[PDB]
């Protein structure tokens, strides 16, 4: 296998967050949810998809943001949409005008109230009035339902009164007066008997009998939810001391008991019930299960998050951590993507979360060690070329110092140099740099291709910094140049060019070419910086080599062999004076003679 399937999916999702981050940065109006809804259409997602539409309706669906009110609206609108669609398709085309009332009459008449019509409704002039009121109510068209009742020809008319004021108010029709009276009538007359829809209207409007369920006409799971939502009374529930209060909390618990995901079958639908019910945490957790698609749970959470929920990793709900853990999968492979996800953490605006974000990024940089990608790269003057994080911005200098110091512990030189460049500690960079180039200079030969490494690194920095307003110490730079000179000597040492090597070595002004001034070379030796003091071993012996090979005794006129001979002599006196302060290879002698 291979499952390009997810990776493709991973990328598609990553793409969407990426665009979302671009919008936030660019102050755009990109909707997250529409974006998923578009993709989600394809399949299995037909659940996840409905979930997204639920969230989207919530877009700016605050509009204040009342839990049950919005859930009710979603269910009510969904039903309405369903109704409109049925009407919107042949018939008659319904005979009359497209009014909402007629659309519902159509649903009731054409849709499945009749296979070929009949049974136990109260009907006048071919129309079940109570069913109509119930469905209109279901649609959210309370006003119309009220009007139907008004016109009704009925004789429970006291109820008619109680419908109108239920409607007039916020729909929590609370008269300090009659509600009590309505309840008694329900129990005595209505409760043991009647037309199912009539009972529904009384029960639902009245909140008559808190033991809950409507016998005959609960036909759908959403019908089931809607009914329950209607029943709860949030406001001024605490006030009034009867225990006929039904709360969202109570509703939420019932959904938990057993009702269970299994019970909400279409398990498919359970997800939606959780969102509607306000069990966001549970909802993410539930999405957290099949394949939960950790990916899906993460993004949904992101969406709830945009909504400003999350108001206080299979089972770990916190947004920061949900995101962070998600990153664990891909972070090594796709550090850029990880950054994009971590960035969402800020979406929950407030301190704490902000630090969590910062810590997460800091944690990402450390141990991923993707410095160039994350932090930045190469100056060519022109400061840093921004890393992905920098595009996001801010605390970046302190992270660098932290990382760089750590590099120092590990001894990950190169990383340290890289980090310090970003730090813009120019002096520090060269000094670390001198050390790196300095060793690797002393050693044994056969190396140094002309294109890449510590030497090459050396060349980069010098060209780079020195011309430009150089902040480094003169001393530091000086050793730097010396190391470079010695290196060029290496390039030309071997690959022929014997003569050229002597010229350059002499230029170094380290080794006595002149007279017996070898000793002055002693006096100036101990003074030498640690980096050079180490390198001298090869300087000598390079000299006695070229000196040897060049001064190969020639065949058969001016031939001044004497020089390039005196040079060896002075050099040997030099080597003779400091052998103890040298590694211990006066095997200059072997090359010296023949």
């Amino acid at each position: 296998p291979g499952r390009s399937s997810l990776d493709n999916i991973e990328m598609a999702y990553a793409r969407q967050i990426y665009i979302y981050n671009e919008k936030i940065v660019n102050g755009h109006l990109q909707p997250n949810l529409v974006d998923l809804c578009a993709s989600v259409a394809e399949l299995d997602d037909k659940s996840i998809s409905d979930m997204w539409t639920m969230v989207k309706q919530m877009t700016d669906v605050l509009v204040r943001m009342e839990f049950v009110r919005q859930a009710l609206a979603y269910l009510e609108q969904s039903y309405k949409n369903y109704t409109l669609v049925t009407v919107f398709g042949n018939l008659h085309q319904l005979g009359g005008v497209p009014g909402t009332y007629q659309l519902v009459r159509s649903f009731l008449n054409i849709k499945l109230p009749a296979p070929l019509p009949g049974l136990q409704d109260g009907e006048v002039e071919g129309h079940p009035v109570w069913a109509l009121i119930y469905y209109c109510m279901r649609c959210g068209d309370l006003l119309a339902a009220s009007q139907v009742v008004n016109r009704a020809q009925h004789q429970l008319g006291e109820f008619k009164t109680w419908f109108q004021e239920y409607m007039n108010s916020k729909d929590r029709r609370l008269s300090p007066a009659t509600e009590n009276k309505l309840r008694l009538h329900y129990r005595r007359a209505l409760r043991n008997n009647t037309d199912p829809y009539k009972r529904a209207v009384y029960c639902i409007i009245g909140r008559c009998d808190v033991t809950d369920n409507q016998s005959e006409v609960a036909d759908k799971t959403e019908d089931y939810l809607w009914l329950k939502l209607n029943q709860v009374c949030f406001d001024d529930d605490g006030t009034s001391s009867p225990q006929d209060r039904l709360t969202l909390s109570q509703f939420q618990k019932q959904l938990l008991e057993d009702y269970g995901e299994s019970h909400f079958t279409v398990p498919f639908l359970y997800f939606q019930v959780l969102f509607l019910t306000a069990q966001f945490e549970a909802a993410v957790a539930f999405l957290f299960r099949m394949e939960r698609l950790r990916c899906h749970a993460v993004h949904v959470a992101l969406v709830l998050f945009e909504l400003k929920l999350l108001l206080k990793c299979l089972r770990r709900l916190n947004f920061v951590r949900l995101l962070m853990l998600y990153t664990r999968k891909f972070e090594s492979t796709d550090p850029r993507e990880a950054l994009q996800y971590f960035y969402f953490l800020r979406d929950e605006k407030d301190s704490q979360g902000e630090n969590m974000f910062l810590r997460c990024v800091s944690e990402l940089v450390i141990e991923s060690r993707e410095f160039d990608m994350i932090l930045g790269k190469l100056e060519n003057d022109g400061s840093r070329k921004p890393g992905v994080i920098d595009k996001f911005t801010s605390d970046t200098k302190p992270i660098i110092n932290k990382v760089a110091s750590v590099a120092e512990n590990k001894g990950l030189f190169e990383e340290a140099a890289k980090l310090y460049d970003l730090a813009k500690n120019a002096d520090k960079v060269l000094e670390l740099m001198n050390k790196l180039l300095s060793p690797v200079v002393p050693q044994i030969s056969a190396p140094q291709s002309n294109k890449e490494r510590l030497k090459n690194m050396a060349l980069s920095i010098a060209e780079r910094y020195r011309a430009q307003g150089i902040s480094a110490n003169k001393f530091v730079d000086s050793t730097f140049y010396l190391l470079l000179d010695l290196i060029t000597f290496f390039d030309e040492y071997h690959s022929g060019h014997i003569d050229r090597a002597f010229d350059i070595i002499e230029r170094l002004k380290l080794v006595p070419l002149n007279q017996e001034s070898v000793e002055e070379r002693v006096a100036a030796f101990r003074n030498f910086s640690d980096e050079i003091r180490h390198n001298l071993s090869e300087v000598l012996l390079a000299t006695m080599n070229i000196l040897f090979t060049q001064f190969k005794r020639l065949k058969g006129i001016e031939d001044r062999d004497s020089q390039l001979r005196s040079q060896a002599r002075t050099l040997i006196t030099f080597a003779g004076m400091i052998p103890y302060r040298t590694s211990g290879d006066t095997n200059a002698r072997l090359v010296q003679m023949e």
Binding site: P1, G2, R3, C295, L314, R315, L317, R321, R328, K329
Partner: protein, 290 residues
């Protein structure tokens, strides 16, 4: 130089082999000292350092340094002798007593493990003992993660030990001979028996913690399986077939793992990578599912 330390290392090996010490408590001390010594000798260095040293030896162009390699060789010789004897003692001991001293002995076994990887041990150890016991203990690992809640406490003991056991298993798998021994011990079978994989973790303490923990077990076991697979000849070899069966039988978990988030995500991400490595490493699980 920790030469002076070397002598103590020898004494420690001597006592352990002797298995004198009514107290496992005593042996725990021996294990601890040995552990530090093994760790101390190789300050964290990785294959790069070894390669550099070899080149320098390259050959003794001039005067080379081969100090750390020489030190490791001396340690390994000492250890070998004493070794067969002591391996017996260390494993049996293991089990019991000391769930305590355990934290100490499993850590000692793992350090030792790198060094003396390769060699020696594989043969000795193999046989015995260990394998049989360790595979059976995989099964029981699943059961042990549940018992995990209870014992959170007795957890301290065992985290020091159970994690150490997984590590020991992973290390054996990294090499050819070790992987063979684990597989011979019937690794796939024990894993089937543990039933760690043949389930869904989400199904089911703060829930994100349990998911992190369960997924955590899954990542190490999955690494052990991937390592055993690759470490043989993953191709026509028998190993490839066994791993494929592993994937297909525990399919849909692999698929399910692919999407979501948290530290839990981090563990999930690692698990996902591990499956991917298993996939390509075998006959492409996809390739097989033509």
């Amino acid at each position: 130089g920790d030469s002076s330390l070397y002598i103590i290392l020898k004494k420690l090996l001597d006592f352990i082999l002797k298995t004198g010490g009514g107290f496992q408590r005593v042996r725990t001390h021996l294990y601890g000292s040995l552990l530090y010594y093994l760790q101390i000798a190789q300050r964290p260095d990785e294959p790069d350092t070894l390669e550099a040293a070899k080149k320098t030896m390259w050959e003794r162009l001039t005067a080379p340094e081969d100090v750390f390699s020489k030190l490791q060789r001396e340690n390994i010789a000492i250890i070998e002798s004493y070794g067969a004897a002591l391996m017996e003692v260390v494993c049996r001991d293991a089990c019991d007593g000391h769930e305590i001293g355990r934290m100490l002995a499993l850590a000692l076994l793992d350090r030792i493990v790198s060094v003396d990887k390769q060699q020696q041990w594989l043969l000795y150890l193999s046989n015995s003992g260990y394998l049989k016991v360790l595979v059976d203990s995989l099964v029981e690992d699943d059961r042990t993660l549940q018992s995990l809640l209870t014992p959170q406490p007795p957890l301290l003991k065992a985290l020091y030990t159970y994690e150490s056991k997984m590590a020991f298993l992973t290390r054996v798998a990294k090499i050819q001979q070790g992987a063979l021994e684990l597989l011979r011990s019937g690794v796939i079978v024990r894993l089937a028996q543990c039933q760690v994989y043949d389930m869904r973790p989400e199904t089911d303490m703060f829930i994100p913690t349990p998911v992190d923990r369960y997924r955590q077990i899954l990542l190490p076991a999955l690494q052990l399986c991937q390592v055993i697979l690759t470490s043989s000849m993953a191709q026509h070899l028998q190993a490839a077939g066994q791993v494929l069966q592993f994937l297909i039988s525990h399919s849909d978990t692999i698929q399910a793992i692919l999407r979501c988030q948290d530290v839990s995500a981090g563990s999930l991400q690692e698990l996902a990578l591990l499956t991917g490595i298993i996939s390509k490493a075998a006959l492409p699980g996809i390739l097989s599912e033509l």
